[PDB]
Design a protein around this nucleic acid. Structure first.
Ligand SMILES: [Mg+2]
Ligand SMILES: [Mg+2]
Ligand SMILES: [Mg+2]
Ligand SMILES: [Mg+2]
Ligand SMILES: [Mg+2]
Ligand SMILES: [Mg+2]
Ligand SMILES: [Mg+2]
Ligand SMILES: [Mg+2]
Ligand SMILES: [Mg+2]
Ligand SMILES: [Mg+2]
Ligand SMILES: [Mg+2]
Ligand SMILES: [Mg+2]
Ligand SMILES: [Mg+2]
Ligand SMILES: [Mg+2]
Ligand SMILES: [Mg+2]
Ligand SMILES: [Mg+2]
Ligand SMILES: [Mg+2]
Ligand SMILES: [Mg+2]
Ligand SMILES: [Mg+2]
Ligand SMILES: [Mg+2]
Ligand SMILES: [Mg+2]
Ligand SMILES: [Mg+2]
Ligand SMILES: [Mg+2]
Ligand SMILES: [Mg+2]
Ligand SMILES: [Mg+2]
Ligand SMILES: [Mg+2]
Ligand SMILES: [Mg+2]
Ligand SMILES: [Mg+2]
Ligand SMILES: [Mg+2]
Ligand SMILES: [Mg+2]
Ligand SMILES: [Mg+2]
Ligand SMILES: [Mg+2]
Ligand SMILES: [Mg+2]
Ligand SMILES: [Mg+2]
Ligand SMILES: [Mg+2]
Ligand SMILES: [Mg+2]
Ligand SMILES: [Mg+2]
Ligand SMILES: [Mg+2]
Ligand SMILES: [Mg+2]
Ligand SMILES: [Zn+2]
Lengths: 81, 129, 87, 155, 144, 150
RNA sequence: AGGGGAUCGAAGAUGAUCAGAUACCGUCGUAGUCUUAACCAUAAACUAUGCCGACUAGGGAUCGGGUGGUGUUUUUUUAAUGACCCACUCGGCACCUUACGAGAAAUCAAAGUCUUUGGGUUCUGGGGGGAGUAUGGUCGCAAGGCUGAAACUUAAAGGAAUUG
RNA sequence: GCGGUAAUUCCAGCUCCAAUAGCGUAUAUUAAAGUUGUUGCAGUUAAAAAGCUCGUAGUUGAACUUUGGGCCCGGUUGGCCGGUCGGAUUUCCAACGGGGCCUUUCCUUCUGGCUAACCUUGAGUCCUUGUGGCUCUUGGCGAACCAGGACUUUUACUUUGAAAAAAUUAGAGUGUUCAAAGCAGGCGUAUUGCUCGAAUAUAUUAGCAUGGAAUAAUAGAAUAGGACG
RNA sequence: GGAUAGUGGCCUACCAUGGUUUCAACGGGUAACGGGGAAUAAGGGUUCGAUUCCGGAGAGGGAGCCUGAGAAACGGCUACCA
């Protein structure tokens, strides 16, 4: 306070902030590759779903929507990229 | 809604100074803001500033010192008729020795002394002392 | 503040807050000048020799006296760590 | 404005002193006269190709353009062969150091060598008193229509 | 910015508002309503000459107790009747009824003097000759 | 902030700096553009497409992988509706409201709402109308709107 | 204009009180209070404080939304849930302490960033009374609403704080 | 505000003040008045935020599109010398401005007339060991503008300039004895005439004419009815 | 077309339905001739201009006209009104 680096602020205190108030703004949602070992291939999903995403071939489910992040369905897995 | 983008940038600088700070993060920057920041810097009243590039419209960090009392904007960009510039600096500069009125002419965004030397005129932007 | 032919006219050129380069005017009796003593090889504080700093009353009232001392002394070489330019 | 008929009056319309000898067998029936009004105003081809008569035409008639040359945007085309344009402008009040929007409507004769519609910007030229109010004659359309055919139906 | 439009073209509005609010100025309003010419016993002019109807004895306002000696004057250009005060000790002995006095204002811009209720005027001359004179004795009142 | 109320809610997509990429994103322009048009074909709105192509597939932003907004991809492949969907959904709303004010005259609060809705319509109309996307003399009316939206 | 009319209850009538007592207090109780259809458009309709945007400073609560956790409590077999706890973040209703700053003060995170006087815009005021009166227009079934003067009078009226 | 019995205020005497051939008074207007507020007002409680929202006119309205760098030309002040018989210009130097080039860069455009300018060079050289210097025709600059054709997105701002009555005003020169004025006057051979004047400025809003291209608008290519040939 | 010195709804015929307006039309008031200018002096302003120069209008009020290069003249005529 009174004198500080607005240009190179600490990752942490930048981390806690709102997504619109970071130095350059950017998103905080991610994408994932989700499995349900009945199948062999892996459908990519947005961290925030709205649409209750259905798998490639089987009308199974995958995730349900929420206020924000999707609820992934029981016996599943994921990586993030 | 956001009206003179210049205005906010100036006012922000002034509350940093008054609060005794050394830095401002202004938003959203502009051709004009830079060229106004650019004049002050040229004459001491602030340090080094920096454009940061959000892919939007821009932010600027200004580093300032404390040589600065006030940097205001004249909110209707009035027209000034090369005679009338005398009467401006008179109304709003602390004395005849220092401080600048900066305006905008066809020949560029310049303080009034450069305006006087270049001998052109135009619209009035703001001022620094 | 000279004059026609050289000649330093107008008395008294005021001090200056070493933290905000604003003037430290006279009636400001809330301002402060801290003398930090130069030391030598093995303790020994060398009387009458200081690294000094002056801070406006404004700054002290705002509480910004400590953190500002921190930064000034350290980047003048008498503190290592303590301060951080990032936040 | 005109359109159609041409010989539509009680008197016979004709350019004055432009005799066509019936004896001499011609391939154009009517010998026509025109000029170039000057000041670099193209006498458009519709005034040469034309058959209309309009004596108050700057290219085919016995007016003459001299004096003020003005521009304005068309605001009324309800009068036969004459329009009304609005010349807008800002007027400066010294005490406040600010201007206010003002405007004026100038009535002006428009030769059937032009096809004007509301909204067209039009360069008019001062001429002699041509009627009670009209002291100007349309002399070039610096417009077109303002992208009307780019308002057609659906895909 | 409170109120006033700061635009560069907002001249018109800015003008109009002024016209509007000049009316809240007492004098401007008086000037244009022609209040002077319209109401007001004098023409609007500096003095007016009229004729004496009755000599009056107006009781002063508190906290003063007095009898103030005045004249009802019927202005000549007007017929308007007006009560005027007759300055300085005696002087009411210089007037008499049907005589022709010359009235002036009281220097309060309309508005009666001190403790004289209603009197908005004073006598300056009777029978063409000036009170002041008659008082000092520099001059004598005319024949008839 | 907030046109027809006193709301002040900051809330928006924070779009990425990454104006191209993802790089972990395979597929192709080809791939997504077809993917858009079949959903156009199903009758979906570009928004619904973006949302659908967002989660179920990888389409971070349609315009990225294909330098074109979704509504322009539609227009070109000849799918674009008569009127913009925001105008549409405004009208669809004002109908539903209106239907309700009919069946419930006593509901002064609804009357109020309908005004608001329409006053957004009517200003939005005048924008589109100005910029020629709507034919100069297009007009919203009660009597004819319930035909319009469906 | 219908319906309804329990209750409380302008008007009225009373018992008392009083020098008087057209009242306060007690009783009786008409309209009304409730509802439908249509009017009326006013309240100290109050935060006596226009709206949009930027900036300026600390604190613990809380309401809604979300994110993070080898947090608690729920047992079953761990979970899943749900409620709870802690940190953070938007956006609410407020309180707290400060006051760089503002104010005639009382007080004010706006009433701040104003003689170092300009972000955009709307509206109202210009001593007091006369007076929200007269008049004309207009709206209304009416009661009244909106618009709304002058002559004349007048040296104060007024505000916040102080001591009595 | 004084005056109801010792009136600092009335009626006078004395004395004293202010302005003075002039001084009071009445009315009006102007300054004071930031109490009409563009500059520059005030509205919680002193006068003043419409009960509330919508909303036309009106005023207003985010950011972004040739920037940066390199080269040449010649000006006007100022320094350190002055060479010179108070002012002079060359080289040294800074400083502040103007113009024109090349950087991927319309300058409206063809069709000649015109050329002032160097990529030239044709000779060589006044002279400091030579790019210090200009005369100088035979291959090779466009724009500096004539004039004819063929065409041109609209504006605001600002610069300089024309066209412009006098008296008034600001202001130069001149000792109307001074001055307000006036535009006179001043010199000698005062016997036969000599001569300086009768400036300058302001003159704006509009129209005109020109330079500028920041600021703020306008128009352009999306059903291609696009642009160049 | 007529009329004029001549353009022109200037007037007449025929035909049409236009013209102006919250950017304030139209109407009302002016104890209103306009201008150069005058008064007040930080600046921005405020107020004034019947009146020595320029323009316009009039000759008690209206209209008409003769002469003439030029008047709708008034120290010209004609009529009505006062
Ligand atoms: Mg017609
Ligand atoms: Mg009032
Ligand atoms: Mg009487
Ligand atoms: Mg009379
Ligand atoms: Mg917001
Ligand atoms: Mg709104
Ligand atoms: Mg949202
Ligand atoms: Mg009942
Ligand atoms: Mg009773
Ligand atoms: Mg009783
Ligand atoms: Mg009673
Ligand atoms: Mg009220
Ligand atoms: Mg309250
Ligand atoms: Mg806080
Ligand atoms: Mg009193
Ligand atoms: Mg005595
Ligand atoms: Mg005595
Ligand atoms: Mg005495
Ligand atoms: Mg005097
Ligand atoms: Mg100003
Ligand atoms: Mg005030
Ligand atoms: Mg009040
Ligand atoms: Mg309110
Ligand atoms: Mg802009
Ligand atoms: Mg000029
Ligand atoms: Mg002169
Ligand atoms: Mg005709
Ligand atoms: Mg009609
Ligand atoms: Mg008006
Ligand atoms: Mg008159
Ligand atoms: Mg005059
Ligand atoms: Mg006048
Ligand atoms: Mg007169
Ligand atoms: Mg005459
Ligand atoms: Mg007479
Ligand atoms: Mg008559
Ligand atoms: Mg006559
Ligand atoms: Mg005579
Ligand atoms: Mg005569
Ligand atoms: Zn599956």
């Amino acid at each position: 306070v009174l004198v500080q680096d607005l240009l190179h602020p600490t990752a942490a205190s930048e981390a806690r902030k709102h997504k619109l108030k970071t130095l350059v703004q950017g998103p905080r949602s991610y994408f994932l590759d989700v499995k349900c070992p009945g199948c062999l291939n892996i459908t990519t999903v947005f961290s925030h779903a709205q649409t209750a995403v259905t798998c490639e071939s089987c009308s199974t489910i995958l995730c349900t929507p929420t206020g924000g992040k999707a609820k992934l369905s029981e016996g599943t897995s994921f990586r993030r990229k | 809604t956001r009206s003179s983008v210049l205005a906010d940038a100036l006012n922000a600088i002034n509350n940093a100074e008054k609060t005794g700070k050394r830095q401002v993060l202004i938003r959203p920057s502009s051709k004009v803001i830079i060229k106004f920041l650019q004049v002050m810097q040229k004459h001491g009243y602030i340090g080094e500033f920096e454009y940061i590039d959000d892919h939007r419209s821009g932010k600027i960090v200004v580093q300032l010192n404390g040589r600065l009392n006030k940097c205001g904007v004249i909110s209707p960009r009035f027209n000034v008729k090369i005679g009338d510039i005398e009467k401006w600096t008179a109304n709003l500069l602390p004395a005849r020795q220092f401080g600048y009125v900066i305006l905008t002419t066809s020949a560029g965004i310049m303080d009034h002394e450069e305006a006087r030397r270049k001998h052109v005129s135009g619209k009035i932007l703001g001022f620094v002392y | 503040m000279e004059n026609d032919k050289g000649q330093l006219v107008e008395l008294y050129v005021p001090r200056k807050c070493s933290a905000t380069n604003r003037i430290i005017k006279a009636d400001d009796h809330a301002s402060v000048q801290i003398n930090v003593a130069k030391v030598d090889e093995e303790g020994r504080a060398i009387p009458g020799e200081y690294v000094t700093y002056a801070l406006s009353g404004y700054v002290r009232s705002r509480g910004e006296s400590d953190d500002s001392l921190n930064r000034l002394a350290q980047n003048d070489g008498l503190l290592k760590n303590v301060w951080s330019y990032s936040r | 404005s005109t359109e159609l008929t041409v010989q539509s009056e009680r008197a016979f319309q004709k350019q004055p002193h432009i005799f066509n000898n019936p004896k001499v067998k011609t391939s154009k029936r009517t010998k026509r006269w025109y000029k170039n009004a000057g000041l670099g105003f193209k006498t458009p081809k519709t005034a040469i190709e034309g058959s209309y008569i309009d004596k108050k035409c700057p290219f085919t008639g016995l007016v003459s353009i001299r004096g003020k040359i003005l521009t304005g945007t068309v605001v009324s085309t309800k009068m036969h062969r004459t329009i009304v344009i609005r010349r807008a402008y800002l007027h400066y009040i010294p005490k406040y150091n600010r201007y206010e929007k003002r405007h004026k409507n100038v009535p002006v004769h428009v030769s059937p060598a032009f096809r004007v519609q509301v909204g067209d910007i039009v360069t008019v030229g001062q001429c002699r008193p041509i009627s009670k109010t009209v002291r100007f004659n349309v002399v070039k359309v610096s417009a077109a229509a303002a992208k009307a055919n780019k308002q057609f139906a659906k895909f | 910015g409170k109120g006033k439009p700061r635009g560069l073209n907002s001249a018109r509005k800015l003008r109009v508002h002024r016209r509007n609010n000049r009316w809240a100025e007492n004098n401007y309003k008086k000037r244009l309503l022609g209040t002077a010419f319209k109401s007001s016993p004098f023409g609007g002019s500096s003095h007016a000459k009229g004729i004496v109807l009755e000599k009056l004895g107006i009781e002063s306002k508190q906290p003063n107790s007095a009898i103030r000696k005045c004249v009802r004057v019927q202005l000549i250009k007007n017929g308007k009747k007006v009560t005027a005060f007759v300055p300085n000790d005696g002087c009411l002995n210089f007037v008499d009824e049907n005589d022709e006095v010359l009235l002036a204002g009281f220097g309060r811009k309309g508005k009666a003097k001190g403790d004289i209720p209603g009197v908005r005027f004073k006598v300056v001359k009777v029978s063409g000759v000036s009170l002041l004179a008659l008082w000092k004795e520099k001059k004598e009142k005319p024949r008839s | 902030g907030r046109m027809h109320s006193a709301g002040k809610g900051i809330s928006s997509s924070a779009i990425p700096y990454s104006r191209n990429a993802p790089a972990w994103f395979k597929l192709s322009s080809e791939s997504v553009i077809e993917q858009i048009v079949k959903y156009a074909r199903k009758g979906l709105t570009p928004s619904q497409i973006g949302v659908l192509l967002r989660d179920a597939h990888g389409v971070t932003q349609a315009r990225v992988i294909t330098g074109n907004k979704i509504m322009r991809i539609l227009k070109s492949n000849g799918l674009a509706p008569e009127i913009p969907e925001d105008l549409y959904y405004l009208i669809k709303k004002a109908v539903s409201v209106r239907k309700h004010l009919e069946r419930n005259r006593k509901d002064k609060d609804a009357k109020f709402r309908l005004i608001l809705i329409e006053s957004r319509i009517h200003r939005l109309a005048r924008y589109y109308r100005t910029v020629a996307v709507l034919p100069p003399n297009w007009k919203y009316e009660s009597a004819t709107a319930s035909a319009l939206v469906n």
